[PDB]
Amino acid sequence: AGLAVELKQSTAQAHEKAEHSTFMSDLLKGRLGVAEFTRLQEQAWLFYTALEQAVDAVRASGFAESLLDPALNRAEVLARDLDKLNGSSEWRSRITASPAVIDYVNRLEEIRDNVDGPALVAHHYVRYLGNLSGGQVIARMMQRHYGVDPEALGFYHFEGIAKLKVYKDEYREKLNNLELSDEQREHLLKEATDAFVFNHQVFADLGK
Ligand code: HEM
């Protein structure tokens, strides 16, 4: 039972922990506010920027090309959302990576500079399949609990992909068809675990 399934199984426990961080739990249940959502999206712009440099490098190397669809790119969409949420472009010169984000960005830059395809695919799975798959729930809760304008929720929209359910199915088939060795597969799986570890610390730092 192939890679897509093994990824899901392998990270299922971490995914469930992710739903329950104090920050995310509090956010989704209405206990926070648009300001806290904006702080999250600012950190996310930082790590999606880094992620997408690593994706560009890996795609250019010819690994997992069809998986690494540039239509998934989130950083510029995020910046447009952040221009709406903050009311201006002034965030870019005020924002600072949290310590958790420094660690995560450093890993992403390591993957980039090593052109580590298997490692990159792990982080691509955790970031993009998560959004493609469940981001709509988060966006609905930001609208319903805090009145965020959907124009500021572009991050969750995948402009340019129509049929998201089919896209998800195809994304999994690409994972299943990747040519990996036993060593590349274990590295990818470990990395997907580490990805959830990084995300957990980002949320913890947001919650402080
Ligand atoms: C820590 C931030 C999160 C990350 C990195 C993340 C990651 C992911 C990933 C990788 C998937 C794909 C699982 C798979 O099918 O292989 C996924 C799916 C999903 N996530 Fe999240 N998730 C996060 C938080 C959340 C939250 C807070 C919710 C709200 C309940 C949520 C709801 C869902 C839903 C409904 C799916 C679709 C079913 C699935 O693909 O398994 N996620 N998420």
Helix (H, G, I), strand (E, B) or coil at 88: coil
Residue for token pair 């712009």? 45
Find, among 99, 135, 130, the residue nearest to 12 by Cα.
Answer: 130
Cβ 77 vs Cβ 155: under 8 Å = yes
Length of the chain: 208
Experimental method: X-ray
Helix (H, G, I), strand (E, B) or coil at 117: helix
What percentage of the chain's residues is helix, strand, coil (to nearest 5)?
Answer: 80, 0, 20
Residue for token pair 């209405």? 30
Q: What is the dihedral of CA 206, 106, 77, 201, to 10 degrees?
A: -20
Domains of the chain with bracketed CATH? 1-208 (1.20.910.10)
Q: Cα of 135 to ligand 1 centre, how many Å?
A: 8
Nearest CA to ligand 1 atom 5: 126
Q: Cα of 133 to ligand 1 centre, how many Å?
A: 6
Burial 95-115 (b: 16+ CB within 10 A, else e): bebbebbebbbebbeebbeee
Token representation of residue 69 = 């669809």
* φ/ψ (deg, to 5) at 64: 55, 30
Residue for token pair 């510029």? 76
Find, among 1, 4, 20, 41, the residue nearest to 192 by Cα.
Answer: 4
Which of 133, 171, 191, 199 should be mutated for ligand 1, with most atoms under 8 A from CB?
A: 133
Find, among 9, 8, 37, 31, the residue nearest to 203 by Cα.
Answer: 37
Token representation of residue 114 = 């090593």
Query: Residue 177 contacts by C-beta under 8 Å, 6 or more apart in sequence?
Result: none
Specify the amino acid at residue 134. G
- Helix 164-177 to helix 3-19 angle (10° resolution) is 120
Instruction: Report d(CA 177, CA 150) in Å as an integer.
Output: 36
133 Cβ below 6 A of ligand 1? yes
How would you write 156-191 as a 3-class SS string? Answer: HCCCCCCCHHHHHHHHHHHHHHCCCCHHHHHHHHHH
Token representation of residue 170 = 């195809």
Instruction: Report d(CA 206, CA 46) in Å as an integer.
Output: 14
Give resolution in angstroms: 1.7
Token representation of residue 1 = 């039972």
